[PDB]
Amino acid sequence: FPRVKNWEVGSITYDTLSAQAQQDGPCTPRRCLGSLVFPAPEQLLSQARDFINQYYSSIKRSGSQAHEQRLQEVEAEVAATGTYQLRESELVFGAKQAWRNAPRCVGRIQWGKLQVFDARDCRSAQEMFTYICNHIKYATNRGNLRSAITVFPQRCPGRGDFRIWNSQLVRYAGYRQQDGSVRGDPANVEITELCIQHGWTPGNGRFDVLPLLLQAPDEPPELFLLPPELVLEVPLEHPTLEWFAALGLRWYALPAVSNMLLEIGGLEFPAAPFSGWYMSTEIGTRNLCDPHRYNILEDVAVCMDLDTRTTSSLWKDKAAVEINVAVLHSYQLAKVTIVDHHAATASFMKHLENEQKARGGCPADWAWIVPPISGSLTPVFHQEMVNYFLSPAFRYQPDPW
Amino acid sequence: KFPRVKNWEVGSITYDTLSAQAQQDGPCTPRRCLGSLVFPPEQLLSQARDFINQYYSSIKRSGSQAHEQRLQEVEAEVAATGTYQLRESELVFGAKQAWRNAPRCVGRIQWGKLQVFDARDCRSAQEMFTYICNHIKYATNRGNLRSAITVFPQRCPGRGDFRIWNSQLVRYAGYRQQDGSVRGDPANVEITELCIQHGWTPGNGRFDVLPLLLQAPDEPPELFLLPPELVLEVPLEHPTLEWFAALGLRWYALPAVSNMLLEIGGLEFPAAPFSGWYMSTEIGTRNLCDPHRYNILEDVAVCMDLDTRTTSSLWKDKAAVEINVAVLHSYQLAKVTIVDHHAATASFMKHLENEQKARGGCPADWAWIVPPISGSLTPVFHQEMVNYFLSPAFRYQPDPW
Ligand code: HEM
Ligand code: HEM
Ligand SMILES: Cc1cc(N)nc(CCc2cc(CCN(C)C)cc(F)c2F)c1
Ligand SMILES: Cc1cc(N)nc(CCc2cc(CCN(C)C)cc(F)c2F)c1
Ligand SMILES: C[C@H](O)[C@H](O)[C@H]1CNc2nc(N)[nH]c(=O)c2N1
Ligand SMILES: C[C@H](O)[C@H](O)[C@H]1CNc2nc(N)[nH]c(=O)c2N1
Ligand SMILES: [Cl-]
Ligand SMILES: [Cl-]
Ligand SMILES: [Gd]
Ligand SMILES: [Gd]
Ligand SMILES: [Gd]
Ligand SMILES: [Zn+2]
Numbered sequence: 001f002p003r004v005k006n007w008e009v010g011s012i013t014y015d016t017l018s019a020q021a022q023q024d025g026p027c028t029p030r031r032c033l034g035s036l037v038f039p040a041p042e043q044l045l046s047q048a049r050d051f052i053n054q055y056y057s058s059i060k061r062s063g064s065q066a067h068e069q070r071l072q073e074v075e076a077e078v079a080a081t082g083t084y085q086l087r088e089s090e091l092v093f094g095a096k097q098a099w100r101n102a103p104r105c106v107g108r109i110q111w112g113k114l115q116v117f118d119a120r121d122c123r124s125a126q127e128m129f130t131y132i133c134n135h136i137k138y139a140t141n142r143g144n145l146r147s148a149i150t151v152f153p154q155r156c157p158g159r160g161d162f163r164i165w166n167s168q169l170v171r172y173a174g175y176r177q178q179d180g181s182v183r184g185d186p187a188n189v190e191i192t193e194l195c196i197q198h199g200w201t202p203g204n205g206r207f208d209v210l211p212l213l214l215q216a217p218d219e220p221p222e223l224f225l226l227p228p229e230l231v232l233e234v235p236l237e238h239p240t241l242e243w244f245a246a247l248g249l250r251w252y253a254l255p256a257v258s259n260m261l262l263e264i265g266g267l268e269f270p271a272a273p274f275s276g277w278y279m280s281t282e283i284g285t286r287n288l289c290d291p292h293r294y295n296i297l298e299d300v301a302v303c304m305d306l307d308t309r310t311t312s313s314l315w316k317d318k319a320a321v322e323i324n325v326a327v328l329h330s331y332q333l334a335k336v337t338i339v340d341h342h343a344a345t346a347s348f349m350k351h352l353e354n355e356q357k358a359r360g361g362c363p364a365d366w367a368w369i370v371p372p373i374s375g376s377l378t379p380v381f382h383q384e385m386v387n388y389f390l391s392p393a394f395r396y397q398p399d400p401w
Numbered sequence: 402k403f404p405r406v407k408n409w410e411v412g413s414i415t416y417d418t419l420s421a422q423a424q425q426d427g428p429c430t431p432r433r434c435l436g437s438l439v440f441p442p443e444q445l446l447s448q449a450r451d452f453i454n455q456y457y458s459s460i461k462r463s464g465s466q467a468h469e470q471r472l473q474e475v476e477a478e479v480a481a482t483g484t485y486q487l488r489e490s491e492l493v494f495g496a497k498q499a500w501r502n503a504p505r506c507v508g509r510i511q512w513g514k515l516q517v518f519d520a521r522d523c524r525s526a527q528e529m530f531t532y533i534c535n536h537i538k539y540a541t542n543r544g545n546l547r548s549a550i551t552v553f554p555q556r557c558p559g560r561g562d563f564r565i566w567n568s569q570l571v572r573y574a575g576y577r578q579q580d581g582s583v584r585g586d587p588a589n590v591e592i593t594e595l596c597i598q599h600g601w602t603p604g605n606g607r608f609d610v611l612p613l614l615l616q617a618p619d620e621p622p623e624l625f626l627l628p629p630e631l632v633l634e635v636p637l638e639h640p641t642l643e644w645f646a647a648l649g650l651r652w653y654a655l656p657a658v659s660n661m662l663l664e665i666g667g668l669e670f671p672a673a674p675f676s677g678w679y680m681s682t683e684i685g686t687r688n689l690c691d692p693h694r695y696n697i698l699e700d701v702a703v704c705m706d707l708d709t710r711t712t713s714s715l716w717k718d719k720a721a722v723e724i725n726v727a728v729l730h731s732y733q734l735a736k737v738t739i740v741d742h743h744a745a746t747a748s749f750m751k752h753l754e755n756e757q758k759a760r761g762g763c764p765a766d767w768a769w770i771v772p773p774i775s776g777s778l779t780p781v782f783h784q785e786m787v788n789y790f791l792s793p794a795f796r797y798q799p800d801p802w
Contacts, residue, residue, distance in 0.1 A: 002435055008692045018433045027429030027436070031420045032788040033404055034429070034436035035767035280713075285777055292410050297778070311743035312681075312729045314722055317775045321718045328713045342712035366437035367767055372777030374718045376686055377698070381773065387434040 007382040017361030021388035022050075034387060035367055038396060041078055044266040048074050048084060051265025051392065054097065055090050083156055086264060092116045094264035095149050098392035099274070104368035106344050106380075107276055109351040115139075115148040122152050125216040128162065128271075129224045132212065135273065136169060140232050140254050145277040145337040151262065152271035162271035163400045165213035165221050166191055169256035169273055170231055173208040184208060186292055194401065198223050206294075207233075207250045215400060234334045238326040243303055247296070251283050251327070253336045261397040270397060277337040279344045284324030285372045296323070320373055341371035345378035352383065363388045406762075410783040419762030423789035424448075436788060437768055440797060442483065445667040448792065449475050449485060452666030456494050484557060486521075487665065493517045495665035496550050499793040500675070505769035507745050507781075508677055510752040511548060516540075518551040526615040526623040529553065529563070529672070533613065534631060536674065537570060541633050541655050546678040546738035552663065553672035561618035563672035564801045567592055567611065570657035570674060571632055574609040585609065587693055599624050607695075608651050610634075616801060635735045639727040644704055650697070652684045652728070654737045660800075665793040675795070678738040680745045685725035686773045697724070721774060742772035746779035753784065764789045 001014045026039035033039060049071060056067040077084040086094065100111040115138065119131045135150045152162045167188075173195075174188040182189060184206045191210060196202050200211050200223055209231050213221040232253035238244035256275035261268055289297045297319050301308050304322065306315035324340075331338035339347075348369060355362035364385040375381050403416040428441035435441065453475065457468040471488075478485035487495065493515075501512040516539065520532045532551055540549040553563040568589075575583045575590035583590055585607050593611060597603050601612050601624050610632050614622040633654035639645035657676035662669060690698045698720050702709055705723065707716035725741075732739035740748075749770060756763035765786035776782045 002433065002438075005439070007439070015433075021432050024431035025429075025434055026431075027427075027434045028431060029426035029429065030423045030789060031404065031417075032427055032429045032434060032436045034434045034788075035786050036404075037407070037409065037785065289778065290410070290783075292783075312733070312741045314726050314729070314741070314743075316743060316778045317722045317725070320775065320778055321715055321722060324718070325715055328715070332713070340713040340715070342715075342717060346712075367771075370768075370776070372782065373775055374715075374721060375771070375776050376691065376773035377717045377721055379692075382691075382693075384438045387436075388432060 002386050004384045004386060006384070008379060013356055013361075015361035015386040017355075017359045017390075018363070018386050018388045020390070021363075022047075022391055023389045025387065025389060034365075041082065044083070045075060045078055047266030047391065048078070051090075051094065055093050058093055083154075083267070086267065088118060091118060091120075091151060091264070094392045095151065095262065095272075095274075098262055098264065098394050099149075101363060101390040101393055103363040103365040103387050103389075106279065106348045106369050106371075107339075109347040109354075110147055110276065111351075113147060115146060117148060117150040119150050119152050120154065122162065123216075125214040125219065125222040125224075128152060128214050128216065129212065132164075132169060132214075132273065133227070133230060135275070136226070136230050136254060136256070139256065139275045140230075143232060143253060143334060143336040145253065145275075147274075147276045149262075149272060149274035151269055153269075155268040155270055160217035160219075161215070161400075162217060163215040163221075164258040164271055164273060165194065165215060165400055166210060167257070167259045169212070169258050169275070170226075170252040170254055171210045172206070172252075173203065173210050175202065175204060185287075185294065194221075195223065206248075209252070221400075232336065234330050234336055236326050236330045237333070238322060239329045241304070241322065241326075244300075244322075244326055247299075249288070249294075249296070251278075251287070253277075253331075255282070259397070259399070261395045262392070263395055264392045274394075277339065278331075279339050279341060279371075280324055280327045280331070281341045281371045281373055284327035285320060288323055288327075289320050317373075324373065341374065341378060345369070345371065345380045349379050349383065361386060363390055404787050406785045406787060408784050410780060415757055415762070417762030417787045419756075419760045419791075420764070420787050420789050422791060423764075424792050425790040425794075427788065427790060436766070443479070445484065446476065446479055448667030449479070452495065452793065453491075455498070456491050459494065484555075484668070485666075487668065489519060492519060492521075492552060492665070495793040496552065496663070496673075496675075499663055499665065499795050502764060502791040502794050504764040504766040504788050504790075507680065507749050507770050507772075508740070510748040510755075511677065512752075514548060516547055516549040518549065520551050520553045521555065523553050523563070524617070526617045526620070526625070529565075529615045529617065530613065530625045533565075533570060533615070533674065534628070536676070537627075537631055537655060537657070540657065540676045541631070544633060544654060544735060544737040546655065546676075548675075548677045550663075550673060550675040552670055554670075556669040556671055561620075562616070562801070563618060564616040565659040565672055565674060566595065566614035566616060566622055566801060568658070568660040570613070570659050570676070571627075571653040571655055572611045573607075573653075574604065574611050576603065576605075586688075586695065595622075596624060607649070608634075610653070633737065635731050635737055637727050637731045638734075639723065640730045642705070642723065642727075645701075645723075645727055648697070648700065648704070650689070650695075650727075652679075652688065654679075654732075654735075656683070660798070661795045662798040663793070664796055671798060678740065679732070680740050680742060680772075681725055681728045681732070682742045682772045682774055685728035686721060689724055689728075690721055718774075725774065742775065743779060746770070746772065746781045750780045750784065762787065764791060 001016045026033040139148045172185040173192045174184040212224045215221040236249040258273035262272040288294045301315045301319035307313045365387045366385045406415045428435040475485040496517045536551045572589045573586040574593045575585040613625040616622045637650040659674040662671045663673035689695045702716045702720040708714040767786045770781045
């Protein structure tokens with residue numbers, strides 16, 4: 001079992017949980033591909049059996065009558081129908097485990113506090129839209145954000161999938177421009193073109209909230225506009241740089257990933273959007289300063305009167321720090337939940353300790369856990385980590401178009 | 402079978418066909434990735450044959466007279482002696498190749514410019530010391546640093562090794578107290594206690610340059626005082642924070658790793674110190690701000706009058722940026738070669754491009770190439786990388802005790 005060192009303290013542990021990793025990753029003894037972003041009844045039965053075992057362990061009933069009854073029920077149902085249905089309590093536990101198991105999530109200290117909305121009865125794209133609006137309203141909670149997931153019907157033979165085409169529930173449009181540039185968010189050029197192609201009347205601002213493209217089984221996607229008062233946004237200002245407000249920057253309160261697949265005991269839920277709250281570097285560093293996103297770094301450093309003609313002035317570093325200050329200050333001013341990268345990484349360290357005691361390890365992706373500014377000033381930098389795949393899980397899936 | 406490698410800033414794609422040559426298997430398996438871990442008789446002919454083939458291809462001389470002749474002499478040498486001696490040019494070529502192959506080195510754009518001192522006829526810790534002294538004075542070059550390596554005799558059966566007990570040629574002492582904690586560099590507490598134990602009169606200071614412990618085969622070590630005028634150091638001041646100088650901080654000019662083992666064509670050199678010049682985050686971020694190193698971050702924030710009461714002021718990030726600024730300003734004022742993390746990572750992207758054309762890929766350790774501050778502000782953050790072991794190589798090796 002892999003030995004894992006923390007270099008700040010000197011601590012050493014062994015990740016025995018990795019030995020139970022079922023599915024395979026991209027690395028081999030020849031070559032590590034850790035840094036890559038994107039790496040049958042009997043086999044459904046064996047996944048389902050393992051998950052039912054996990055559920056009954058969690059409720060201190062391993063080996064009991066009800067445990068064997070459920071194992072028997074599942075096999076009989078797979079034999080009769082080729083699939084099976086989760087009980088409500090099994091779904092809640094499986095959604096929480098999927099979050100717990102997610103190696104790229106630094107916020108997992110919260111994994112047990114998750115509101116699970118059971119939308120497995122959803123019938124249409126119109127009902128899907130109503131469920132999603134309720135999710136946004138509950139999770140946003142006027143700025144006091146609450147973690148939640150809404151679970152739409154599982155994949156099943158004989159019918160297409162429910163899908164949300166948008167990558168998050170709230171996203172800003174990206175408009176390919178006159179001179180070939182992009183106005184708005186360049187990460188969203190494709191979904192923006194698809195919304196237009198499906199009848200949306202575009203805007204032409206930098207922060208235009210996108211409509212939703214929702215797909216019911218065996219139906220083309222259907223366009224739904226979000227009511228503006230459902231989408232809470234934060235205008236960005238800086239506590240001491242008063243010209244920062246004149247940049248006209250904004251971001252939205254709710255980070256709600258909507259394009260991932262939830263897998264529980266062999267069953268697959270292609271539509272299951274989940275939401276927490278932001279860590280400030282996601283907005284301040286990646287979304288606003290990535291060269292292929294809003295790319296504001298040089299404009300901010302020029303306004304700060306930094307010497308941008310030489311790298312060794314560290315003008316890039318200084319401007320990025322103040323952009324992250326602006327994000328934190330603005331969300332706090334607006335009373336919208338946010339966590340900074342120091343507090344978030346410290347709480348992740350507590351999670352690793354909790355998980356070492358509970359399960360003997362924790363799957364973690366070092367390159368995603370370490371924040372994109374001030375990496376080695378956070379404790380996770382000095383923590384060796386072991387990356388592997390446990391189920392239940394959130395998985396990437398192909399775009400439906 | 403050839404890993405696809407994407408750059409996410411630009412969208413470009415390459416394939417690492419070079420990876421299909423990795424000898425020493427790394428630590429990862431399909432089951433789990435250990436990429437974040439710091440530390441994971443006639444088979445000599447196999448590695449010697451392959452290395453000689455490497456040599457003659459690099460000089461466009463595969464399949465011709467001189468190439469075949471050299472194959473037989475190593476064959477006869479190993480048959481007659483159980484080992485072989487490298488030609489001078491091969492020793493040079495192998496030193497540059499080991500540098501070129503180091504997955505954790507961001508400065509490899511320089512790999513063709515390397516001064517190779519051949520100390521293979523050395524015998525005794527006294528000869529070592531004068532060799533080390535020639536290197537240090539050559540490499541330092543009054544602050545116009547020049548990359549250099551010195552190659553002490555190779556390992557052979559039945560006889561002890563040449564070893565430098567220090568991890569670098571210049572290290573600062575670390576002294577315990579009436580209370581455990583360390584004055585000086587906590588990373589060197591152990592070699593400090595060895596040097597004192599072997600007869601060295603310790604100092605009282607936070608920046609005492611340690612003596613050398615040099616080990617000829619089969620003899621206990623011998624202490625050597627480095628000539629004070631040969632160890633070039635930089636007192637640290639800040640361009641605009643006039644009190645920063647009063648903190649009394651300094652760092653040395655020459656980074657010279659002296660504890661790694663150089664392997665060429667199956668030959669092992671446990672004493673082969675190599676040196677380049679510093680990238681400024683090594684000093685300003687890791688050495689001065691790591692919690693287990695000089696840990697100066699809060700002292701600098703106090704002097705800057707920052708609000709250390711809340712993490713979301715980003716007082717840690719601000720003080721760290723100014724410490725890096727002070728390192729760069731001080732080294733440039735002293736006319737001592739240094740490179741900032743923006744310049745260095747941009748040069749590495751060019752190196753990746755060169756290596757793609759020259760060899761079809763480049764072994765790179767993402768977690769070590771990405772700098773420890775401002776990670777996503779540098780281009781290497783957005784570049785996927787493949788990590789694997791090629792020979793010749795620099796390898797880690799046990800402490801000589
Ligand atoms: C409660 C506060 C939360 C915080 C502060 C947080 C933090 C983060 C951060 C910073 C990332 C990296 C994302 C990126 O760089 O694009 C991430 C990824 C992720 N989070 Fe969390 N998260 C939270 C809640 C949740 C919840 C509620 C779930 C699911 C129930 C979840 C599941 C995931 C998954 C699956 C990923 C990986 C996504 C990907 O690879 O694209 N997180 N989280
Ligand atoms: C010329 C300027 C150079 C620069 C700017 C540079 C930069 C760096 C940096 C920042 C690291 C990371 C090490 C750490 O974080 O502790 C590193 C590692 C390394 N470099 Fe370079 N380097 C240079 C020259 C060289 C030379 C001349 C050699 C050998 C001939 C070399 C071989 C290595 C090796 C083997 C490592 C791995 C160190 C380890 O794993 O402990 N580098 N380099
Ligand atoms: C629930 C939650 C909380 C939080 N605090 N942050 C997030 C952001 C997740 C996220 C991941 C990515 C990786 C894309 N990569 C796979 C190509 C892209 C995104 F656009 C995105 F939003 C989610
Ligand atoms: C030639 C050269 C040039 C340059 N610019 N930098 C270096 C840094 C080498 C180096 C490696 C390490 C890793 C060992 N540790 C993680 C266990 C630690 C250090 F403190 C250190 F200095 C070398
Ligand atoms: C190429 C590299 O893997 C890529 O840029 C990764 C690195 N680490 C990351 N970490 C987080 N949290 N989010 C990301 O999008 C990325 N991107
Ligand atoms: C645990 C982790 O692997 C360790 O802290 C690594 C991370 N990346 C690094 N990168 C560099 N350049 N140098 C280091 O010492 C480290 N340390
Ligand atoms: Cl986001
Ligand atoms: Cl160093
Ligand atoms: Gd002001
Ligand atoms: Gd402007
Ligand atoms: Gd003062
Ligand atoms: Zn790996």
